[PDB]
Design a protein around this nucleic acid. Structure first.
Ligand SMILES: CC(C)C[C@H](N)C(=O)O
Ligand SMILES: [Mg+2]
Length: 813
RNA sequence: GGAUGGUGGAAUCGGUAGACACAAGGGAUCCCUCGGCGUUCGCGCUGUGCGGGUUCAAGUCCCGCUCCCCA
């Protein structure tokens, strides 16, 4: 064994062994319990950033741990390879999107291998390849035949293809209650985004107008407080009046403008004015609202700006008429100033007033949803072509199966204005049923590829369909999905929906794609800036800052190499703007992958923010050098005898108890609690003890052998290169990757003594060690033999005692 | 959601606050030491943002407070 730990001499050799032996390649083995650990696949942007390293380190810890528990673990990797960034870069360089993408994949693939993530590389997918995207083209035609896809002109104004996600709204909503192992914050975000609401549609007659006008409200209980109506800019009434009204005609093309039209409030008989307003969405509900400025903030502002009546109809929480001098009272409450409805509380008032309007035939209950259909068309080159075609006679139909995939041409030259498949008017020309035809030139929203990759991983070379259901149903649902909270209302909603569409096409037999979602925290770093003589802030990398600390270590002044004085702004999100990014490649090359992985798992709980500190990375590196050292010194003395567990000293028994208690804690921390920082802390604390243990007698050496074999396994999911090597040095059986996770020996953990905390009136006065089965009377006796306790008992009376067996004695005195 | 030492963080049915690490400072990569005040080196007093309550006992439970356009 080498005396020096040299990650450069170890990491690449171990990594080649994983490739040569295909260690992490797995099949659908029905004799093993499966575990599917998935991390969100990266965009091939150029290089890994620290958030990738944290995300993928967390998955790999879990994947390697679950393998050591004896599960059959799938951990796949791939590339979300279409999208805008490659078009930018093709343009800026001499190039095309494809070759730039493929070069970035190679480079980042190598980075991921250098970090030693145990991926099933045989299942690696790049989404920009036709062997991948053909299936989303085929599935899209299937969706179209099922009635779930349509074309419409909208604005986000050009024609677009839409998938009917609103047909699954109620299921996407209901199923949130099955996702106990998703964070509440993500579930709340999706609930709010889907935005189901229960309201009322209300119709008014309008003076001098051939039609009625209808609004949607979730607050019909405030209807007697309605002093005006507001319509969206592009509303047919708003448009009708704008014909004989310059001001309004002027406004539609851009706050509000009086239509001049008067609506008849149907409960009070009063005429109220109809405005056109910019806060009223033509797309949601009817594109018109009944304005209640006393009780909706937005209506409150509009009324104020135009001097419209503000009428109070809801009492304050304490029963008092509200102060609307400042703002709306939005709190639901008891009605007043509302005729027959006065005194009714919210729920009663909602239903009373809905019932009346329904009976009068001017309103009705209505469920609306904020969720819109999913616009999947993009006027961009670097994406999967939409498999639709237009015949000469005008009929739009799917691309015929015998012309799928519709291949995006990769050898193109970009001009930066127009898509090459759009600029070359020959590309669109095709033949269907003899009759000539035009194929769609738009490409899919890139969220298309990421919405099903997690399923394709289960059968990545299957040629007979998007999925081989037997394989998909073996692996799915994903057991844990790791990726950031920022995907909550886009990818994390789309992948739920696409799972359900695949279920309903018969391809999978489960309702939800992932059991647990773990959202890892952001990685932060110190940020500094100086003010140039031009008054501009120039941000200086903490890498490049020279701080100087006070007597206790607080930063109290700082400069760059150029002598500029720096203001310290604390820890912040890594970015280009603040100049505080840390390149993970530099740190892997400086310290080795194992150091980097360990620091990132150690520094903070996975779901909390992580503060990068090079001094912590250095600390992680030193710890690994201490582990290396202990194993070097122990293995230098050769083979060990069998441990004799019955003849151990009390000191030996305590160290062994510490080894096994550590096994139990680290097990519970990694597997149940998912607190990896405290797992590592427990291993460090044990390692400190082990470094102080004798190692000359045969028994001391057998005990050390057992401890080190346990420690190297426990560290392995974090630092697998060093551990792979240390295990061989210890003469552990086979490769560490398939060694069993240590299980704590209950006999080793039995205590023969226990520590009792002796309090006198609630305040600690001693801590005594007694035989483990000492009785309450014996503990008491012992407690009063302690001068430190007795001096608080001197000439005073014990009123009672509290005893928690083997733990605590409190003398109340 | 949060608030615990100079910092990151620990404390898992209320029961030894500050594990582990960093910074630090000192001594010879190994040993210590380390919340604050005092110390006869045994400990004592005090302490989890502030105020109150419950309890033999509160970081943990209760109440109040201060602070980081979808109709
Ligand atoms: C799952 C995808 C939307 C993830 C994306 N490729 C990213 O790195 O965030
Ligand atoms: Mg503080």
């Amino acid at each position: 064994m080498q005396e020096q730990y040299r990650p450069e001499e170890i990491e690449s050799k171990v990594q080649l062994h994983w490739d040569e032996k295909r260690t992490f390649e797995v099949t659908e083995d029905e004799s093993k319990e499966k575990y599917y650990c998935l991390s969100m696949l990266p965009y091939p942007s150029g290089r890994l950033h620290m958030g990738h390293v944290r995300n993928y380190t967390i998955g790999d810890v879990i994947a390697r741990y679950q393998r050591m528990l004896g599960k059959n673990v799938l951990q796949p990797i791939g590339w979300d390879a279409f999208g805008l960034p490659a078009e930018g870069a093709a343009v800026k360089n001499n190039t095309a999107p494809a070759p730039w993408t493929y070069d970035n994949i190679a480079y980042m693939k190598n980075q991921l291998k250098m970090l030693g993530f145990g991926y099933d590389w045989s299942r690696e997918l790049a989404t920009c390849t036709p062997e991948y995207y053909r299936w989303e083209q085929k599935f899209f035609t299937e969706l179209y035949k099922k009635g779930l896809v349509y074309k419409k002109t909208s604005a986000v104004e050009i024609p677009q293809w839409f998938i009917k996600i609103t047909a699954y709204a109620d299921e996407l909503l209901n199923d949130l209650d099955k996702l106990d192992h998703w964070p509440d914050t993500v579930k709340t975000m999706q609930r709010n985004w889907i935005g189901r609401s229960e309201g009322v549609e209300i119709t008014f007659n309008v003076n001098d107008y051939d039609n009625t006008l209808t609004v949607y409200t979730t607050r019909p209980d405030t209807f007697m407080g309605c002093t005006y109506l507001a319509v969206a800019a592009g509303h047919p009434l708003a448009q009708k009046a704008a014909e004989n009204n310059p001001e309004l005609a002027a406004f539609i093309d851009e706050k509000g403008v009086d239509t001049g039209f008067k609506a008849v409030h149907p409960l009070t008989g009063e005429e109220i004015p109809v405005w056109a307003a910019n806060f009223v969405l033509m797309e949601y509900g009817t594109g018109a609202v009944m304005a209640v400025p006393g009780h909706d903030q937005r209506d409150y502002e509009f009324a104020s700006k135009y001097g419209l009546n503000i009428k109070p109809v809801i009492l304050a929480a304490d029963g008092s008429e509200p102060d609307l001098s400042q703002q709306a009272l939005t709190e639901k409450g008891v009605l007043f100033n509302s005729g027959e409805f006065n005194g009714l509380d919210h729920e009663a008032a909602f239903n009373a007033i809905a019932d009346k309007l329904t009976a009068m035939g001017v309103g009705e209950r209505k469920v609306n949803y904020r969720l819109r259909d999913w616009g999947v068309s993009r006027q961009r080159y670097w994406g999967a072509p939409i498999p639709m075609v237009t015949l000469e006679d005008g009929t739009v139909m799917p691309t015929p199966d015998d012309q799928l995939p519709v291949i995006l041409p990769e050898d193109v030259v970009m001009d930066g204005i127009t898509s090459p498949i759009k600029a070359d008017p020959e590309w669109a020309k095709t033949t269907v049923n003899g009759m000539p035809a035009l194929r769609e030139t738009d490409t899919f929203d890139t969220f298309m590829e990421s919405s099903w990759y997690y399923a394709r991983y289960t059968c990545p070379q299957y040629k007979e369909g998007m999925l081989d259901s037997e394989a998909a149903n073996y692996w799915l649902p994903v057991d844990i999905y790791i990726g950031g909270i920022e995907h909550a209302i886009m990818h994390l909603l789309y992948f739920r929906f696409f799972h359900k569409l695949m279920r309903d096409a018969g391809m999978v037999n489960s309702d939800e794609p992932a059991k647990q979602l773990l959202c890892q925290g952001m990685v932060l770093a110190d940020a500094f800036y100086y003010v140039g003589e031009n008054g501009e802030r120039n941000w200086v990398s903490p890498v490049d800052a020279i701080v100087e600390r006070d007597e206790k270590g607080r930063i109290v002044k700082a400069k760059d190499a150029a002598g500029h004085e720096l203001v310290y702004t604390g820890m912040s999100k890594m970015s280009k703007s603040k100049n505080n990014g840390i390149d993970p490649q530099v740190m892997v090359e400086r310290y080795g992958a194992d150091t980097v992985r360990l620091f990132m798992m150690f520094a903070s709980p996975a779901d909390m923010t992580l503060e990068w500190q090079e001094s912590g990375v250095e600390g992680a590196n030193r710890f690994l050098k201490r582990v290396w050292k202990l194993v070097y010194e122990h293995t230098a003395k050769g083979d060990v005898a069998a441990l004799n567990v019955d003849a151990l000293t009390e000191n030996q028994k305590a160290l062994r108890r510490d080894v096994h208690k550590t096994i139990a804690k680290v097990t519970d921390d990694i597997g149940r609690r998912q607190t990896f920082n405290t797992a590592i802390a427990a291993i460090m604390e044990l390692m400190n003890k082990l470094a102080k243990a004798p190692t000359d007698g045969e028994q001391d050496r057998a005990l050390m052998q057992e401890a080190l074999l346990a420690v190297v396994r426990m560290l392995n999911p974090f630092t697998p290169h060093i551990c792979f090597t240390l295990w061989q040095e210890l003469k552990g059986e086979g490769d560490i990757d398939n060694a069993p996770w240590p299980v704590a020996d209950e006999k080793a953990m039995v205590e023969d003594s226990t520590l009792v905390v002796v309090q006198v009136n609630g305040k600690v006065r001693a801590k005594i060690t007694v035989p483990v089965d000492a009785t309450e009377e014996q503990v008491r006796e012992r407690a009063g033999q302690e001068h430190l306790v007795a001096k608080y008992l001197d000439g005073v009376t014990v009123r009672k005692v509290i005893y928690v067996p083997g733990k605590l004695l409190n003398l109340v005195v």
